[PDB]
Amino acid sequence: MRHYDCKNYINLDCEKGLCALTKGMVPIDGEGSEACPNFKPAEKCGNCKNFCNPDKYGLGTCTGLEKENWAYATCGASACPSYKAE
């Protein structure tokens, strides 16, 4: 629901990024951070089928491989070879 969650988001730094479409700088947090109608979800462990059981901090379990491991929900997943959109 934030630019930060969008596939069109271009990362810059800890506080802001760019919208690929508008090429305008957008905030991660707070006022002006909500997704626009053109939103497309960026691939993240948080929206992967192999990601489960997060805790309060977003730390969860990756079942992508035979042996389970931990993962984090906000971890970028566009380059994980096992990512599978939920």
Partner: protein, 869 residues
Amino acid sequence: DIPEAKESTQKLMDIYYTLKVTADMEAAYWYNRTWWENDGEVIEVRRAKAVAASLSHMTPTILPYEKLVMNKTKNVRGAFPFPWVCASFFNAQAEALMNEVDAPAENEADSVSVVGAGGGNVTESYGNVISIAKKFGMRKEEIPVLVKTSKPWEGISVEELSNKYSKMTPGYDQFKNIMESVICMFDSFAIPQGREVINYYMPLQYGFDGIIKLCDEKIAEVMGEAGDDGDFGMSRGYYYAAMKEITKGLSAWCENYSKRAKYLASIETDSEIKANYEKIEEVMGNIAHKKPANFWEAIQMTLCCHFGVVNEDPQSGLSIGRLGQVLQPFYEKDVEDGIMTDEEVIELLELYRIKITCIECFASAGVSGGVLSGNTFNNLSLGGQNYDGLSAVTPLEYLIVEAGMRNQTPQPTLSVLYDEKTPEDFLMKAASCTKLGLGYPAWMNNQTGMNFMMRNYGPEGMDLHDARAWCLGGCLESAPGCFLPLEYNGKVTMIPGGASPTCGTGVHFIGMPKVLELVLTNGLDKRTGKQVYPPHNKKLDSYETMVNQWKEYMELTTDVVNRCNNIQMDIWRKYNMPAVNSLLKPDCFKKGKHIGTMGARYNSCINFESCGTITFVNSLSSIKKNVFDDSKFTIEEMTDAMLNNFGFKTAYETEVFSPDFRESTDKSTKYEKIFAACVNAPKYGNADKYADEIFKAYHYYIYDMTHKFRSYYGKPLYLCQISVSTHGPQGFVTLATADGRLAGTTYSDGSVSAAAGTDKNGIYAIFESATVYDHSMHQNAQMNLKLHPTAVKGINGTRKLLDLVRAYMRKGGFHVQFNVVDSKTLRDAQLTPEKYRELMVRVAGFTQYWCEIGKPIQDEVIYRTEYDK
């Protein structure tokens, strides 16, 4: 006039200036996960697989307007932690944050080191951003990832595992005392690669598919075979398996950028920006597999390599090397065939500066602020001699200087390997850039450097050909190189590339004036109250006795730090050896040995770093003159005067870190006489034989001293003498010194620069003092000079500047670099930094934005002698 920067460059710089230095966890999460998932795998492969995953599973970031792409992380000024190397400087902070208790105090080195609060630095937590190591912004939601990623490393990071074995050396306690007093600035494990020159040869010559094929062939040839080598024969097989894995990693990483470029193209409504995206997709998809087939691909492939290596260890000073020569074959073919114009080449080179400028080194504040002032020292060297001993200057190098003129950024710093064979027009071109006051190009002596190469690396077979391939690792860390035959465009070109591991590792910056202090205070650090060295209890009855006690303390210091730092790097090279750099660095691939097992061609790279040389020499001059020669004062008087800061208020109170002030406290009159004797005693850098003899003696002693010690590679140490920013923190912990320098204030910058405000006989007297010894005796010698802009007005002033450089070089001087600025301007930017966002100054072996330099170094830069003509 300087042509304006390209539109892309300008837009990207606009975005650049707003960016925050950001640490995230992706690479670290992936390295950690893959490492442990492969627990029990042969170390070389386990390591390569982990690095491979930490690269190729990251989110790839591409910005609009970019032509050249890639970054260390998904962020633009991004980095990540390496808890498997070291974590103590953040892991207690992180865990305090999760537990909601007060973050613990920094250690001494970090605490005395300043990170510039301005620019992109995040020196304080704000909003949802945590400041890590007083510099890096990490989103709050990643702190828990930081903690969980770092936890498995307790007891076993290079840091902690090496500390266990260090605790078994007889000198451990002594070593601890030295670190805690900041007599030694930092630990080698902090940045175990760097201060070296990367070698781009392999990918440029073969492409990644080609390298994988070579690995498969070697595996088939040697897997299970030792030859006659019971030590490393069997290990060749695992090396090639490891190299296949890391190479697949680098390939997948490039594919990720291609895929991202493809996506962005698909949603780009601006046709022009869409074209870039599609060019990027092609370039990245190509260099994922093929030998580069044009300039764009080739320079982009060097970036992939460069980013690959700075992502496999925390490090500074992975030098680009002589990119203008490496890429000349790719450049000239594109211009020949009309694939690119020079202006288009200049655009890539402009954009390239942004990429290099954005490389961050995530490490403790003692390193990032205390030493680096944030710069990562990706040094690009120019000219020198080629394989055949002729001028190496290429037409591409002119363009690199041009790009540095049109797009003024701190990186890459440019370094002219000044040589008599260099064409005048290139020399003038370089000088016209230097006179701008960007700080680059710096000027280093090709002949002196080659001489040091032949001397230091002679025992390893260094020849004239490899010596000619040398250039600067990091700022000034002369690093071995060699030429390798790049076939391209139907011809073979011998291109340079680095040929050693780190040349800026071992015994790190020793605050020599501080060691002198403790000679005078009988081993007790009066700044902290802590007894650091065993009291010597010697009556300092003579200059010789005092100097001998300094030597004794220096050798003890060197000994215990050396032993511990050997363990640090040895643990690192055995459990954490380079993957990417072991692929790239000759002769690893040829021998089937990685960097840890001396695959590199030249391994006598480990060294000893001095700091505060001139402060130290000037202090000896003062003591010898005022106490032992003229007997005008007693050693007790001198010591008392130093301990009381000559009655002046201390920098610990005033926060002025140069002689620029001296808040003249009442008690100063008490010391006014001795203080004047101290200021007035002969000073280095005035062609004064009294001071210069001491300086000369120091050099012959220190050469002899360092070479008695052996690195983990079994090679003698040598001297590296730069300051970087270290004269800040080490000045801070040092009380007033006998040369009249006050407490807590910076040491002299560099190593043959005159101490602040003590050069009173012209620049040439400094040149003369600096060259009373042969600079090739050591790795380097570092000189800073500041000229008033009016001093180099006009093409005449360009020539005047070049002639000043030639005068010094021809005396055998190793290095000179310039500020060209009015110091009033700097004083002004200090009062209001927000008003000077793009102002840069030359500090020491690096250029940096004023706003990201801490006050102590700012003060020091402001106070450097300003020459009028």
